[PDB]
Design an enzyme around this catalytic site. Structure first.
Site, mmCIF file in Angstrom:
data_model
loop_
_atom_site.group_PDB
_atom_site.id
_atom_site.type_symbol
_atom_site.label_atom_id
_atom_site.label_comp_id
_atom_site.label_asym_id
_atom_site.label_seq_id
_atom_site.Cartn_x
_atom_site.Cartn_y
_atom_site.Cartn_z
ATOM 1 N N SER A 84 0.809 -1.199 0.000
ATOM 2 C CA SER A 84 0.000 0.000 0.000
ATOM 3 C C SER A 84 0.859 1.273 0.000
ATOM 4 C CB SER A 84 -0.958 -0.058 1.180
ATOM 5 O OG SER A 84 -2.032 -0.957 0.899
HETATM 6 C C1 LIG Z 1 -1.939 -2.151 1.541
HETATM 7 O O1 LIG Z 1 -0.907 -2.804 1.664
HETATM 8 C C2 LIG Z 1 -3.269 -2.611 2.111
HETATM 9 N N1 LIG Z 1 -3.241 -4.027 2.370
HETATM 10 C C3 LIG Z 1 -4.259 -4.888 1.972
HETATM 11 O O2 LIG Z 1 -5.277 -4.541 1.379
HETATM 12 C C4 LIG Z 1 -3.965 -6.329 2.347
HETATM 13 C C5 LIG Z 1 -4.274 -6.714 3.768
HETATM 14 C C6 LIG Z 1 -3.384 -7.532 4.447
HETATM 15 C C7 LIG Z 1 -3.657 -7.904 5.764
HETATM 16 C C8 LIG Z 1 -4.821 -7.455 6.385
HETATM 17 C C9 LIG Z 1 -5.711 -6.635 5.690
HETATM 18 C C10 LIG Z 1 -5.439 -6.264 4.373
HETATM 19 C C11 LIG Z 1 -3.609 -1.769 3.343
HETATM 20 N N2 LIG Z 1 -2.403 -1.305 4.041
HETATM 21 C C12 LIG Z 1 -2.218 -2.080 5.273
HETATM 22 C C13 LIG Z 1 -1.262 -1.306 6.127
HETATM 23 O O3 LIG Z 1 -1.058 -0.118 5.750
HETATM 24 O O4 LIG Z 1 -0.782 -1.937 7.109
HETATM 25 C C14 LIG Z 1 -3.589 -2.301 5.946
HETATM 26 C C15 LIG Z 1 -3.653 -3.512 6.886
HETATM 27 C C16 LIG Z 1 -4.092 -1.049 6.663
HETATM 28 S S1 LIG Z 1 -4.661 -2.682 4.517
#
Ligand SMILES: *C(=O)[C@@H](NC(=O)Cc1ccccc1)[C@@H]1N[C@@H](C(=O)O)C(C)(C)S1
Length: 641
Positions: A384
């Site tokens: 992300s």
């Molecule tokens: C970006 O990496 C996003 N990740 C996902 O959509 C996958 C995911 C993995 C585990 C649990 C839930 C979702 C978002 N960015 C992370 C982060 O910034 O730590 C989140 C858990 C907020 S979702």
């Protein structure tokens, strides 16, 4: 002239056999041993080339300016110039002379000692003296040693000064518990085939104070390569190993008694670090007195290599990974100085270079977490964190209005029913009206997916191609260029959306990530990272607009300061921070049940002194890169403004 064509071919065939190292084929091209014919038999010529060319490690014999004339009904003379590579460099501008013999049907060479070396006559000998060069040092940005040659004390036992079967078995247990060594392994050491009673069998290298020496324990000071940080920089620095006979065959300039870099920077800068061998290659007479010096130059030690690494930052970044799988990259984003290049788990470079058992080495290779991998040079899905780039691109091409609110109801969303069961997922449904600041604080994948699809593949790749995708960075680290997808077209709205939140076919290594994200510390200018200190700062203008930088960086502050920001745990530091977290899902890359990687990006938005990109590969539960950044962020904030 009809036979002169065969004479030039025979001289050509003779040199090729010497160049290829097949001295028996070259000796079989000489005439019979006689006065004014060949001076030695085929076997005698074989044993002389094997002795002289083997001693000087002659390789790559190449000739030029060949001329073959006539002088009799059977005596055809030849002459050429030649160059060859030896243990002391290239021996060039060699004047060779000789005569060929045309008898019966085939043409041979009247061999003479002057065909080994130009001025050799009769029973002249050849001597070679060499002096090994001292390997250069690898130092950090402040002169601290990262790889140097020192005097390490070595622990060892002498079997004769032990006991007699009853008293010997007691000291083996005594010498094993006072140095933390397996008592069953000490007997394994003194049981090798090379061991004699009154011999010094080495055991381990003491990296600290010498304890009490039991009956038969001796300490001998020896010189060897030493790595002061050990595991904390093993992937970056590498290790040196014993030079083999096959190494000499590929490069005779190497010292047969020296060490050669096997991995990391030790191997990448092996030529500058190993120096040049000094000595003399001379032709003596029959008694052993010098008469002609072919090659001679003084020993030149290796050059020191000064890195941009901070040893205190390298050690802190590695220790913060707690032995888990991951890596951390720290840079000064305005110049690109790589402050830290840590990779965990790691191996012991001092153990590798000072002798290691085949068990401990197999433990490194059979380790599932794979400590030999340089993870800072391994491509990953950015996670992300890539939403920063996707947002900046959308802001530049007018797709994203920072204050426009997209209505996102729920935790899942799909474009149409053509997506099937796939849906871009969300972590929170508490905010249905999502703008850019909300999407960066909560890490809203649906917002990034919808804005990427609204942008389109053409506009998305236009801004992406302004980055360093597909470029080979000028770094002494082996890596593959980053990629947007496997092909030049997504050919899928799902893959376009997944790339929007950094989870498609993207592959960017941590070093390349720090290069891409540096635009937010230079008003949209990408600054390439550099590892060598003396290099110039190379950058890339106008990668993203400065308007987008002045919009996203304030929101990146809120990722830390907002009470619901995904990086709110870092607000305890009380330092100016702009961050963006990330968690990527890898589904059966080889084959498994579901693995996820954690990512963290952070830098100082006030002074742009430092920038950090940490990651955890195949993370454990309730573990993340953000949990482990307080120590490194504290050091970089105080020492790099
Ligand atoms: C970006 O990496 C996003 N990740 C996902 O959509 C996958 C995911 C993995 C585990 C649990 C839930 C979702 C978002 N960015 C992370 C982060 O910034 O730590 C989140 C858990 C907020 S979702």
């Amino acid at each position: 002239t009809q036979a002169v064509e065969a004479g030039e071919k025979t001289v050509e065939q003779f040199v090729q056999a010497l160049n290829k190292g097949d001295y028996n084929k070259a000796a079989e091209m000489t005439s019979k041993k006689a006065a004014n014919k060949s001076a030695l038999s085929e076997k005698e010529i074989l044993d002389k080339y094997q002795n002289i060319y083997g001693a000087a490690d002659v390789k790559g014999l190449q000739i030029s300016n060949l001329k073959v004339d006539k002088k009799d009904d059977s005596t055809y003379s030849f002459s050429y110039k030649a160059k060859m590579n030896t243990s002391l460099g290239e021996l060039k501008d060699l004047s060779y002379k000789g005569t060929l013999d045309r008898n019966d049907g085939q043409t041979t060479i009247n061999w003479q000692p002057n065909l080994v070396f130009p001025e050799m006559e009769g029973n002249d000998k050849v001597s070679l003296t060499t002096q090994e060069a001292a390997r250069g040092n690898i130092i950090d940005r402040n002169g601290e040693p990262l790889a140097t040659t020192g005097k390490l004390k070595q622990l060892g036992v002498v079997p004769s000064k032990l006991g007699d079967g009853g008293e010997k078995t007691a000291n083996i247990k005594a010498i094993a518990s006072s140095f933390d060594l397996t008592e069953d392994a000490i007997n394994q050491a003194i049981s090798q085939s090379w061991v004699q009673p009154d011999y010094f069998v080495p055991l381990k290298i003491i990296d600290g104070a010498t304890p009490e020496l039991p009956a038969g324990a001796t300490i001998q000071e020896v010189d060897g390569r030493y790595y002061p940080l050990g595991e904390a920089a093993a992937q970056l620095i590498g290790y040196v190993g014993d030079i083999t006979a096959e190494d000499i065959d590929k490069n005779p300039e190497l010292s047969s008694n020296g060490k050669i870099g096997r991995s990391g920077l030790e191997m990448a800068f092996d030529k500058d670090l190993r120096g040049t061998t000094g000595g003399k290659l001379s032709i003596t007479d029959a008694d052993g007195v010098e008469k002609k010096v072919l090659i001679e130059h003084e020993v030149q030690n290796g050059k020191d290599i000064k890195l941009t690494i901070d040893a205190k930052a390298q050690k802190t970044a590695f220790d913060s990974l707690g032995g888990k799988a991951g890596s951390t990259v720290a840079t000064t984003p305005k110049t690109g100085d790589l402050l830290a290049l840590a990779s965990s788990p790691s191996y012991d470079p001092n153990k590798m270079t000072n002798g290691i058992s085949q068990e401990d080495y197999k433990a490194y290779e059979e380790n599932p977490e794979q400590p030999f991998i340089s993870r800072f040079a391994t491509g990953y899905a950015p996670g992300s964190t890539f939403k920063m780039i996707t947002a900046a691109i959308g802001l530049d091409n007018g797709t994203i209005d920072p204050n426009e609110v997209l209505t996102i109801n729920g935790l899942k969303w799909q474009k149409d029913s053509s997506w099937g069961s796939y849906q871009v997922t969300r972590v929170s449904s508490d905010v249905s009206q999502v703008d850019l600041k909300t999407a960066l604080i909560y890490s809203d994948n649906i917002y990034a997916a919808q804005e990427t699809l609204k942008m389109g593949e053409k506009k998305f790749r236009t801004g992406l191609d302004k980055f360093i995708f597909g470029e080979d960075l000028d770094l002494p680290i082996s890596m593959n260029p980053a990629q947007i997808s496997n092909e030049d077209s997504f050919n899928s709205d799902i893959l376009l959306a997944d790339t929007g939140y950094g989870q498609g076919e993207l592959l960017i290594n941590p070093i390349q990530q720090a290069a891409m994200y540096s635009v937010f510390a230079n008003n949209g200018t990408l600054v390439y990272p550099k590892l060598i200190a003396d290099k110039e700062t190379k950058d890339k203008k106008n990668v993203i607009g400065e308007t987008a930088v002045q919009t996203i960086v304030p929101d990146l502050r809120e990722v830390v300061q907002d009470v619901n920001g995904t990086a709110h745990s870092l607000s305890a530091l009380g330092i100016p921070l702009a961050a963006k977290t990330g968690t990527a899902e890898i589904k059966e890359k080889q084959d498994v049940k579901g693995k996820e990687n954690s990512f963290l990006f952070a830098f100082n938005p006030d002074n742009q002194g430092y920038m950090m990109v940490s990651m955890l590969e195949n993370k454990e539960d309730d573990d993340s890169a953000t949990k482990r950044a307080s120590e490194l962020l504290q050091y970089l904030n105080q020492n790099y403004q």
